[PDB]
Amino acid sequence: HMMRSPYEYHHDLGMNYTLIRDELIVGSQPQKPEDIDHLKQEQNVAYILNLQQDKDIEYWGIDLDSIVRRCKELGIRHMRRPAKDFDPLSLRSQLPKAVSSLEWAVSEGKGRVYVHCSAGLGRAPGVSIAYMYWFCDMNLNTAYDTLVSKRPCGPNKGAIRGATYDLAKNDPWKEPFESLPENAFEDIADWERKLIQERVRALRGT
Predict the structure, then answer these.
(1) Measured CA distances, 109 to 100, 104, 112 (Å)
(2) Where is the active site?
(3) What are the catalytic residues?
(4) Bridge partners (DSSP) listed for residue 77
(5) CB count, 10 Å around CB of 206?
(6) Terminus-to-terminus CA distance in the chain, angstroms?
(7) If you compute the radius of gyration of the chain from its CA atoms, what whole number of angstroms results?
(8) Is 192 marked as binding a ligand?
(9) Sequence-separated (6 or more) residues with CB below 8 Å from residue 69
(10) Hey, which residues does 47 pair with through a beta bridge?
């Protein structure tokens, strides 16, 4: 067993994950049905949030149907909110829906939510940080540092900031997010946070 690179996916090492908050685990894709048994037995997982595109599951040669079947057998709910890999625009567009699924599953309270993409290095940490920022009473830099300190990875902060802009927006003719400096929407006022939480919850089951 040899040295590997630190911020890159090593699929041959099997499913890997990090517990970020009691309710929330961020990791790489389950590779076979036995990995679902591990999650249920060792981590009390009751929900899986899969952020991959079909193209990703195909590339990786994963039998998703057998994964999902085992989830159902064990009472786990499997959810899909796809986003494109290494694509901040995709992540930004899909963040509100992905976070809606996550936050719904947390609110149900039946067990831990396992949030993953192919590697759990971009998409899955990005969704998790947005959830912490919007729902767990922190600013964006705190939310960001809290995850990255536990699980070294490279989520796009701009994607999360831009989804925050998108959800706080009340004027369809506001200047674009792309014109604003790095600091815009890195914190949100209490009324904006309330607006965001309602809009995210309104996407539950869309």
Answers:
(1) 15, 9, 8
(2) 117
(3) 117
(4) 47
(5) 7
(6) 45
(7) 17
(8) yes
(9) 33
(10) 77, 113
CATH classification of the domain holding 42: 3.90.190.10
- Strand-pairing partners, residue 130, are none
Residue 118 annotated as binding site = yes
Handedness of CA 47, 126, 147, 202 (dihedral sign): negative
185 closest CA partner among 153, 141, 135: 141
Residue 53 carries which DSSP code?
-
User: Do residues 45 and 25 lie in contact, with contact meaning Cβ atoms separated by under 8 Å?
Assistant: yes
Contact 134, 163 (CB under 8 A): no
* AA identity, residue 176: P
**Which amino acid appears at position 93 of this protein?**
S
d(CA 92, CA 90): 5
The total domain count for the chain is 1
Resolution (A): 1.6
Contact criterion met (CB below 8 Å) for 61 and 127:
no
Whether residue 80 is annotated as binding a ligand: the answer is yes
Q: Phi/psi at 24 (nearest 5 deg)?
A: -140, 115
Q: Method of determination? A: X-ray
22 is in an annotated binding site: no
Cβ partners under 8 Å of residue 192, min gap 6: 168
Cα dist. 66→13, 60, 147, 203 in Å? 20, 14, 30, 28
- Residue 9's φ and ψ, nearest 5 degrees, are -75, 135
**Which pair of structure tokens corresponds to residue 169?**
């927006």
Q: Is 79 annotated as a binding residue?
A: yes
